[PDB]
Amino acid sequence: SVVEEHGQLSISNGELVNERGEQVQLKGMSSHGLQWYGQFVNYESMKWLRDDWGINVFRAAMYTSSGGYIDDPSVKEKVKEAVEAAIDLDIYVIIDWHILSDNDPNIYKEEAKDFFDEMSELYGDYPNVIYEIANEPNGSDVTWGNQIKPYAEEVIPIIRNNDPNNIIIVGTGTWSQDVHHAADNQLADPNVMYAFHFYAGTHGQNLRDQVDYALDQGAAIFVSEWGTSAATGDGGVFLDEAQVWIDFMDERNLSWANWSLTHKDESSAALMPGANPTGGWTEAELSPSGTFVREKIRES
Ligand SMILES: OC[C@H]1O[C@@H](O[C@H]2[C@H](O)[C@@H](O)[C@H](O[C@H]3[C@H](O)[C@@H](O)[C@@H](O)O[C@@H]3CO)O[C@@H]2CO)[C@H](O)[C@@H](O)[C@@H]1O
Where do the H-state alpha helices sit in the chain?
2-6, 34-37, 43-48, 76-89, 109-123, 149-162, 173-176, 179-183, 205-216, 239-251, 288-299
Q: Which of 225, 241, 251, 285 is catalytic?
A: 225
Atom of ligand 1 nearest to the CA of 175: 20
Instruction: Give residue 32's identity as a one-letter amino acid code.
Output: H
Q: 268: Cβ below 6 Å to ligand 1?
A: yes
The answer on whether 76 is annotated among ligand-binding residues is no
Annotation marks residue 251 as catalytic: no
Query: Measured over all CA atoms, what is the biggest interatomic distance in the chain, rounded to whole angstroms?
Result: 48
DSSP strands (E only) in 2-105: 10-12, 15-17, 27-31, 57-63, 92-98
Instruction: Give residue 250's identity as a one-letter amino acid code.
Output: D
| Ligand 1 centroid from CA 32, angstroms | 8
Instruction: Give residue 256's identity as a one-letter amino acid code.
Output: W
Q: 233: Cβ below 6 Å to ligand 1?
A: yes
The answer on whether 259 is annotated among ligand-binding residues is yes
Annotation marks residue 5 as catalytic: no
249: CB partners within 8 A, 6+ apart: 25, 223, 256
How was this one solved?
X-ray
Q: How many helices (H) and strands (E) would you count in the chain?
A: 11, 10
Q: Is 143 helix (H, G, I), strand (E, B) or coil?
A: coil
Q: 272: Cβ below 6 Å to ligand 1?
A: no
In total, how many domains does the chain have? Answer: 1
> How far is the first Cα of the chain from the last one, in angstroms, to the nearest whole number?
16
Q: Whose CA is nearest to atom 16 of ligand 1?
A: 100
| Ligand 1 centroid from CA 88, angstroms | 29
Supply the range of the domain harboring residue 235.
1-300
DSSP 229-283: S-TTS-S---HHHHHHHHHHHHHTT-EEEEEEES--SSTT-SB-TT--TTS---G
Q: In angstroms, rounded to a whole number, what is the distance separating the alpha carbons of residues 22 and 16?
A: 8
Atom of ligand 1 nearest to the CA of 66: 28
Resolution limit, Å: 1.6
Q: 122: Cβ below 6 Å to ligand 1?
A: no
Would you say how long the chain is, in residues?
Answer: 300
Q: In angstroms, rounded to a whole number, what is the distance separating the alpha carbons of residues 48 and 29?
A: 12
Q: In angstroms, rounded to a whole number, what is the distance separating the alpha carbons of residues 44 and 141?
A: 42
Please report, for the domain that includes residue 70, its CATH number: 3.20.20.80
Q: Are 223 and 29 in contact (CB under 8 A)?
A: no
Q: Whose CA is nearest to atom 30 of ligand 1?
A: 66
